[PDB]
Amino acid sequence: MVKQIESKTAFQEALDAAGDKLVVVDFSATWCGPSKMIKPFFHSLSEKYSNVIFLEVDVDDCQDVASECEVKRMPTFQFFKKGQKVGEFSGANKEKLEATINELV
């Protein structure tokens, strides 16, 4: 499953509760074609990688998080461990998404 993040405070709670596990954040936009196209895939990943935390930040519904995280384009995937960013790329690239998870778990 994927937790929808609605605030900076919810985002910090998520990062802190993850312990040392990989956290994958999909920064998405409802109006963005490529965001919608990778969303099913992102959810499917969340069900396979039961040891990994998946979050979604909608950049309109939760702009301050998109902003503090320096998001410039959607989809953007950021990767976190122990509250620290350990990866990032942009684009609806499924192969790159699965690979980066495999590289960072």
Cα separation, 59 vs 45, whole angstroms: 21
Torsion of CA 31, 22, 4, 96, to 10 degrees: 20
User: Angle formed by the axes of helices 94-104 and 33-48, to 10°?
Assistant: 40
Cα separation, 11 vs 65, whole angstroms: 8
Contacts of 53 (CB under 8 A, 6+ apart): 3, 14, 17, 18, 21, 22, 23, 24
76 DSSP β-pair partners:
27, 90
Cα separation, 17 vs 67, whole angstroms: 22
- In the structure encoding, which two tokens stand for residue 88, read together? 């990032």
Domains and CATH numbers, the chain: 1-105 (3.40.30.10)
5 DSSP β-pair partners:
57
In this structure, the chain runs to a length of 105
Chain breaks in the chain (C to N over 2.5 A) after: none
Task: Give residue 32's identity as a one-letter amino acid code.
Answer: C
HSE-CB at 41 with a 13 A cutoff on CA atoms is 16
